[PDB]
Paper text:
L‐Asparaginases (ASNases) catalyze the hydrolysis of L‐Asn to L‐Asp and ammonia. In contrast, the chain of ASNase from Rhodospirillum rubrum, reported here and referred to as RrA, consists of only 172 amino acid residues. RrA is homologous to the N‐terminal domain of typical bacterial class 1 ASNases and exhibits millimolar affinity for L‐Asn. Crystal structures of the wild‐type RrA, both with and without bound L‐Asp, as well as structures of several RrA mutants, reveal topologically unique tetramers.
Another residue that was mutated in order to assess its importance for the catalytic activity was Lys19. This residue is highly conserved in scASNases but not in typical class 1 ASNases. We probed the importance of this residue by mutating it to L‐Ala, L‐Glu, and L‐Gln. In some cases, orthorhombic crystals with a doubled c axis were obtained, belonging to space group P212121. The a. u. for these crystals contained a complete tetramer. The kinetic data, even when reduced to approximate turnover numbers, demonstrate that Lys19 plays an important role during catalysis and its mutation reduces the rate of catalysis by two or more orders of magnitude. It appears that Lys19 may play a comparable function to Tyr21, each being responsible for both stabilizing the tetramer and for supporting proton transfer.
Numbering used by the authors:
A (entry chain C): 5 to 168
B (entry chain D): 0 to 168
C (entry chain B): 6 to 168
D (entry chain A): 0 to 169
The structure:
């Protein structure tokens, strides 16, 4: 496979329990736990960007994410991210000429990887393949399919991303 | 019409380490229920995936006749995107055989599995199932092995039993 | 001897809900642990509450006492939040109608449905305690037995400790 | 002085299904590292439990010699509360053997294990470890099997291989 760069921006996928909080915080990146047992053949590296809930991201934050992705010489990019503003980040990156040669896939999980019954590990496998296999562009890989960010919204009534 | 989600992927299960499960009776692992069905239960899929049983043999005990029946089931599917979960010991044999079937020419057919049973701690299974479902949807028509976060050409691949990996010839 | 298990909620039973963007008190985790415990003996589970123990009032503890008093069983396990486990245990230890019973409170500092949880160990340990201890009221946590009158939850330490 | 938590329990490990783990070399389960150590890492214990490896043979491979070596290790512990994790197939034989040693008269010695490996989904292991730790602390001196959420008298217990359960002899 082509070299894959993974950026971690936080989200439910990375949530972990803290006694002090009496609840979940955004913890260490769950993608690193999945890849530790994936027996990878190829070149993959993981970079920490942010440990935020995506609800708390500003236009400034999205701009910083785009410049960070442009710092990678890799042409295949996975960004793990909260689902609540995944569409906004993806649309923002889709507009950056500097990223036009890259395949950039955003993913995450509706249930924390550290909670029972999580979609995280499946989503990570699916999104790593998507980052390696899709043509240049910006995509959301969730629910075992590929979404066009310009034509996607998160439907909270369904608990899924859906096309517009 | 209101939007209908397609179900473009079909999964077949042929057993293998991925599906092993502990049985008191035997004091060890047997080939059990398909682990791929457990991963997809919590994957919050937009579509559905039809999962069909073909076999629960060890991939070491496959004959001509077993490989031929897998070819018919895959050939008869309406879907053009197919994942076959399978033992790793003879995954190359099965993949090479399916490569020779003109009836599969318009289909993307991916074989995958796991070096560690899904029901054992520290398993590659869930990652490999996500990666392989993506590969089955995104690769051009052909027959592939998706393992170790990469895609292998069956004609140019062997299983290294001692090293626990697929590798190039 | 027959064991009766009451569930009053707590961290042990927390589960994720998409609606909440976080944890809520979910179904009792003790039922998931006992499902695979291959039990030989008579055990039954009753739902009492799904609160964070922080929201428990005197009336809440009173309802819990009457429910335990409805059980003919002499071996009782109560799963519960850790934050007011001492208050509930002290209240039950004052009820003459429960004097013949061994009543053990337990729970977990990490939710059973979160990785790295003490829940399953705590449930095994507490079920043994409920069956093996003399009549009384006890907290079983950290692999030992606490006397409620002489115990506090030290949030700085993250453990129950003697006073 | 400031309060010191005692460590009144010692754990010995003799193998068994509880400790099984998958090995690619073998294309199956072997007796791996002691699973009790994994349970106690996340148990938030007040004390500290010393865990001592005695054996990794399958319980069916135990000799008289092996049982004797286990009795000498248990007898030499200073702790009066002892848990021995073990295979279920010959747990009764090891338990009966220990029950005959005068050296163990003042100790509460509990044998436990699991019908399903701790590293396999749906395992009884973690429950059984919590139960057995409590049993080793709370039971009077003697030798016991703690399985299925109850305490067995080794002299009046058999392993039902078919049902994967310990049962009384009535
Ligand atoms: N509030 C979370 C929701 C999620 O990731 O599913 C986030 O956007 O970070
Ligand atoms: N806040 C929780 C803490 C715990 O159970 O550990 C409760 O009392 O419900």
């Amino acid at each position: 496979p082509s070299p894959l760069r993974i950026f971690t921006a936080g989200g439910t996928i990375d949530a972990d329990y803290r006694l002090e909080e009496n609840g979940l915080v955004v913890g260490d990146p769950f993608v690193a736990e999945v890849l530790k047992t994936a027996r990878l053949a190829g070149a993959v590296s993981i970079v920490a960007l942010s440990r935020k809930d995506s609800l708390d991201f500003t236009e400034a934050d999205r701009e910083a994410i785009g410049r960070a992705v442009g710092q990678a010489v890799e042409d295949h990019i996975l960004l793990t991210h909260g689902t609540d503003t995944m569409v906004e980040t993806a649309r923002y990156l889709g507009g950056l000429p500097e990223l036009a040669g890259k395949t950039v896939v955003l993913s995450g999980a509706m249930v924390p990887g550290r909670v029972g019954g999580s979609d995280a590990a499946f989503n990570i496998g699916f999104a790593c393949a998507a980052a390696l296999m899709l043509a240049p562009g910006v995509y959301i890989a969730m629910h075992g399919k590929v979404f066009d960010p310009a034509k996607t919204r998160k439907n909270r009534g369904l608990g899924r991303f859906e096309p517009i």
